[PDB]
Design a protein around this ligand. Structure first.
Ligand SMILES: [Cs+]
Ligand SMILES: [Cs+]
Ligand SMILES: [Cs+]
Ligand SMILES: [Cs+]
Ligand SMILES: [Cs+]
Ligand SMILES: [Cs+]
Ligand SMILES: [Cs+]
Ligand SMILES: [Cs+]
Ligand SMILES: [Cs+]
Ligand code: NA
Lengths: 314, 314, 316, 314, 314
């Protein structure tokens, strides 16, 4: 798609609007009062670059925003901070997770945004500016950021739940319903997990640096807030390695239960084999073409001395 | 459930009682002599909060209290220190373990405790006030805290004896009783450990902050005592990471137990097969429609050269 | 094969030529305008040596440039810098990759380049110096070096893509086309990943030092540049480890698949073994040769045959 | 069990004796000449207490003494040094290793020793005193400590050797005598290493600590020696870690053996199965009720051409 | 055996000699001109003590000279430095490696050297003194120490090349020549690796600590070469670790090869049975004693509808 979404606001009031013309939003640069410019759809290179040239942001940053498959990171410029955030979808049952790159610039009184597509995790931060919630009005553009980063960070929690279900609904199938496609899912989880912690790890660094560095973030006013988040991020980081670990032995768990049935199937063939092997034989030999019930008795006799010998095993 | 349970005391005497009226205890904030306030059950949020207000507690600390799914932690504020802890109960046999969150706060001369549910490990501290044991009465709130939390440290230990025991039993089945349920209980263990590891490592970090920082805690007076506790902490970690190291390898032990029983059954079947396969054959060619013991005379001959050839094996 | 190759340029004009005469390039040591000396074929050590002696390069380095089993490293000197890269060629199907050692020294207004064999990645750089593009003409010796280095980095993505395929394919043979030769590949894969990440880890460290360190570098202005490829570098030293971690546990997934299959092979062998062993038997003991309703047998054989069938509806 | 063992000694003469009375060995605190007062059997708290006071040793230490599940640690007070240490014994055969805690306090002119039971590694130390060997007579209680120390650590090498062999031996069984028990002993080994490493790892730090700190221990005189015990402490550790590494994969090594044998019992059956399965058929089909050697020849042709097949595998 | 080989060189001239008398090489302590003394054969504990005291060396050192099972290390003193080093020798084909302890003390104009036996890698160094190659003649005692340390390190490369060959040749066996004794050599490799790894990691720390200290190591003249050897040290470490990683897997790689093969002996088996089981049955059922081709064709029909069915698999 394409769109652009600004949310200027102040302690007293706010205004909001949705345009598709880039020149209607550029004068907010010089707002005294905080703004949030959301640019859905980065695919329009010309929109980005325009915004990118007007604000005074280096080309390589602008090019960064158009490169999609990245680490999450921060970089501190003279008048602006630059951040690179991911934000996941997980379809359940078709066990597959998606990741949309967001990019963010903190200058003057504006929090720039760059979303690949429509549909996003900041529909709570939106409401808090519209209906005068929390301390979101009272404060500045760097708090706005902390609003935006938080809203995203919280999202993971609920993804972290969703998989926590997937694990639980796999260390069952493993040890009770041993099956072909169970193996698939298992690796499918193990993989996705990797992709997760490949993002969350730098994500803690991002927040770890933001907290502990500070330039045009108003210091002893927004930094604990950021720290609160930084705490949130540690938790999760932890919580991935956690699952990672549990999922790893998991495949050997299947293995062990798989083999254990092979065994059972073996015995079955062995005892049925082991008894009707010799009984067919004596039946076969008295087919030699060259007292009747007494052979049947020592058939029965020797048949059941196998039967009480597999009680001593099997 | 729900209760309150104070135990005031000084060098000389002591008092203690119980209620379900928050307003009776509040006055104990202005005690010149120590006080242990035990608000068990934290579902009754108005009580928590009533207090949370009266004593000067900031609402985020108070929310913390309410959320029981937390990183065990410690926050220092101006007139008070704040701590969270976990508390475990392992059901033997079901192989299942449960987590209460214990919240705490030191302030001036008072120890605000917050439990989810009746039932705790603080009895042995209760008695040391009750019958005047040790040097509890001659020392202050911080000490009470130490005490209280040392009383916790000590709990994990039995929990580490109990689990050990579960290791012992499991490392019998694995090698001697190859079975389905054994697989289950093993992983079950793995899981539990993780959760323990997860709790203890941070828990550790807590005592480390306390020890080497100390703000309203009679400094060169208690710090050591916290050191001693800070140590047990460590100990437990070791023990923990020990067991981790052990269990992990366990499954691979059992895996090997069973692939070693497959090899048996294969010899049962193989040799059975291997002697009645050619003997039921050659008395098959004499059941065609086109000396007699000379037949049996070579049927024994080979019958035996087989059982000699598996003495070179088996 | 051997080949010297120089490209001299500045804002206005440029020149280029391919030589097999070493002395027809040395005088570029005293160029006011940038110069990119590419010496393909480091077997002709005498050539290398001469470039050295002339420029005033310390033997150690010189020798290192010949020594092609080496860790990618930066060493900074008085007037020059020294850098050593590796450049990779993955062959697909035969899952087998080869790495060239390229070596670089910036100095005055020269970027000395020593390859091992004709054949590289840099071509698009040569386009940008030839057909006046980007901002490479405007910038000097150093920017170039970045451009050169960037060039290579970029190639690694390419390989990563190709590699990335080599996994997706291989996790359909793992759990659907189980076989011998799948195994082989899996090792080859892992080995190669090993050799690879082995080269990146320091590689990162090369671009890292360069940025936060700096000696004779058109720093202000280009530091950011050195930094932007150093970004890419971490990116890929991560994305490597992603594969290590995935592929590591790959031989276990396969395990789980294979036994599951064997198990099936047992099932069929048994539910046959178990039903036609006895029915062969009772149809065996009626081949006795002593003196003593025939469809009753076929019936009671029908009956007890079917209870076997229905009993493997409680398993199998 | 309970005793006390005094070993006063100077350059000129020495005296020693044994006793079940705590008061006899007190006056020595005031010895101008170094002494070694050994306390065996600290199941007598009452006595451990008594001196605890007398020598002016802070009760926390006295507790840490009487609690025998602890980390090797080092703590330097004003008038004293204090050190906890373990002392391992391997029962060969009953793969199982026991520990006894020895705590130590250097003060004035007396090394204090605290053991759980009679039976220690210190013997050698005594001799050198008894019969004036080395320089130990010429030097003070600090040295006495170092020696008592060096003694014990060295005893770990002895302990290594014993472990080395267990290994040598087990890495035969595995690849030469595949069996149910062999496993057991593997595991056992792996347990005994971990508990070892466990004590060694800290211990190392107990020797690292001493060396780089030095308060009362006549310094550039005794430092170099203590370092030597230290150097050894490191050597020990490394060694331990080598084995862990070796022994981890051992069972993998073992699995690869058993599973490999299965391979052969399968083939075995297969060929006997495969060559007779169709030969008992084709005979079996001529016992129908409705060129005799031509078939046997075919059977001789078609028993021959399975063979040729297996000269391309097996 | 036993030998002493001293070399006393100066920018103008040199002299060298072999003598098994330990009094003739003692004047060289007081040489203005650099000296390199090589003791070969450290079984003679009379000559390490004689030369150990003459130079003034501490015993603890002269004992560690002797202790040839040691972690390579560097220790510094007043008038001399100490360095314990190993040198490896690998038996190809027998897949076995044996070491030797070379100990080294830099003092005045004398590098004392302590070799267990004759046979060593310093033949090239002796070349660069004898014929006046390079710049060792013009340089002093510490350049020698370097030139020495370097030859030894360059040693490990020719070693690493041998091992590479082994891995290569082994990893041909795992995946194509599966067997019993293959799996042994694996383990062999691992051990040796792990012996190698254990030695190298500190040798690194040696040239790490030689390089960033320098007292009677002529500073900005030779510390640019200690660096160079230090570099090759890192390389070797790196390269070595390479292997640990590769090999650790290999074992697993073998097991997948075997456990595939069992399957291909399963298929074989099942199918012959599959077909010659129901067919061996009906022949039986017309071997009962109470339109002929008709069955022969329906045998044809069913025997081959199996055939078909296994082209869907197999
Ligand atoms: Cs980029
Ligand atoms: Cs918050
Ligand atoms: Cs890709
Ligand atoms: Cs592709
Ligand atoms: Cs204790
Ligand atoms: Cs036991
Ligand atoms: Cs050996
Ligand atoms: Cs020593
Ligand atoms: Cs018949
Ligand atoms: Na594994």
């Amino acid at each position: 798609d394409f769109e652009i979404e600004v949310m200027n606001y102040s302690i007293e009031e706010f205004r909001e609007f949705k345009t598709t013309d880039v020149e209607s939003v550029l004068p907010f640069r010089d707002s005294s009062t905080p703004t949030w410019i959301n640019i859905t759809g980065i695919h329009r290179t010309d929109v980005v670059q325009r915004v990118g040239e007007f604000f005074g942001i280096h080309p390589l940053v602008l090019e960064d925003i158009l490169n999609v498959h990245q680490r999450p990171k921060v970089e501190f410029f003279e008048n602006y901070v630059f951040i690179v955030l991911k934000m996941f979808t997980y379809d359940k049952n078709l066990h597959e997770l998606e990741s949309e790159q967001v990019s963010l610039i903190l200058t003057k009184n504006c929090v720039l945004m760059f979303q690949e597509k429509i549909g996003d995790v900041f529909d709570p931060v939106r409401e808090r500016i519209r209906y005068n919630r929390g301390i979101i009005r009272k404060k500045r553009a760097d708090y706005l950021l902390y609003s935006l980063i938080d809203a995203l960070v919280d999202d993971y929690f609920v993804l972290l739940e969703k998989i926590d279900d997937e694990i639980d609904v796999l260390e069952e199938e493993v040890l009770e319903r041993p099956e072909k496609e169970t193996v698939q899912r298992t690796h499918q989880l193990k993989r996705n997990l990797v992709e997760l912690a490949a993002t969350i790890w730098p994500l803690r660094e991002v927040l770890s640096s933001l907290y502990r560095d500070v330039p045009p973030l108003i210091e002893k006013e927004t930094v604990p807030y950021f720290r609160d988040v930084y705490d949130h991020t540690i938790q999760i980081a932890d919580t991935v390695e956690t699952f990672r670990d549990i999922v790893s032995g998991l495949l050997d768990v299947y293995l062990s239960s798989v083999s254990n049935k092979t065994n059972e199937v073996m015995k079955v063939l062995t005892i049925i084999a082991t008894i009707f092997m010799p009984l067919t034989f004596i039946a076969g030999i008295y087919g030699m073409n060259f007292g009747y019930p007494v052979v049947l008795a020592v058939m029965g006799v020797i048949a059941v001395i196998m039967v009480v010998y597999f009680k001593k095993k099997k």
